[PDB]
UniProtKB/TrEMBL annotation:
Binding site for (R)-lactate: 182, 218, 221-222
Protein's UniProt name: Methyl-accepting chemotaxis transducer (TlpC)
Boundaries of the shown chain within the full protein: 34 to 293 of 673
Amino acid sequence: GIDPFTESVLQSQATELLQKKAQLVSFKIQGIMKRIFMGANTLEKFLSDENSAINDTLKRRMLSEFLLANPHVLLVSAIYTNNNERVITAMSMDSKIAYPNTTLNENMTNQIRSLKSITHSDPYYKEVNGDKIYGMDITLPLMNAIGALNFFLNIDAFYTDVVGKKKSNTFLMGKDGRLLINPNREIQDKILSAINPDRRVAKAVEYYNQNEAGTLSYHSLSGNTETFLAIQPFDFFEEKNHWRWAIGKYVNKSLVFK
């Protein structure tokens, strides 16, 4: 406390460690998401093939295998709009893969036929078997499009990837400071600046918007104290803003400085 040398050393050490840990979490998430999108690309080639010996049954098998390999995906749907309009859906709930019957509504329909690049929805709670599951829809055009591939990314399935096996001071942030994952589940889907008066939050969101890693001092909700907070932004999808998340990790100044 009394010593500026010690303080500088301890601070620098603690904020470097914070950033290192946040980078590891984000790298793990990116790896998970890379596998999702690679598989979705593979599925798109099979589901959109002109001259296929593949019937709806074998399409179902491949969709269910996608789910087996990617447990962070709750369901996946091959939606055809061209002719013989139909929805083929595999869904993974509990440990069993079902094939619910979806009828294509005019809501989904035209959005799909004019679709010419990948999109995603805003995060939302989907009701399933009386439970709300936090996630988002991701939609790829079946290629001029003959229909669409849609899957529901289960954001809740990333809970342990973000927070760890033990509770920790780690969260996943989305657009404008929205909390996608938080150890305190009840502040999920909340805007951070709307539930935290600390105006240094803006600098967090700004690190996010600028897309570089950075640290800042920050008053936490879960600890109600002064912390260092690291922000690690990363794209959860790569094309060549819209597909950007960030890991937040923080530590009590009272702990850093003895």
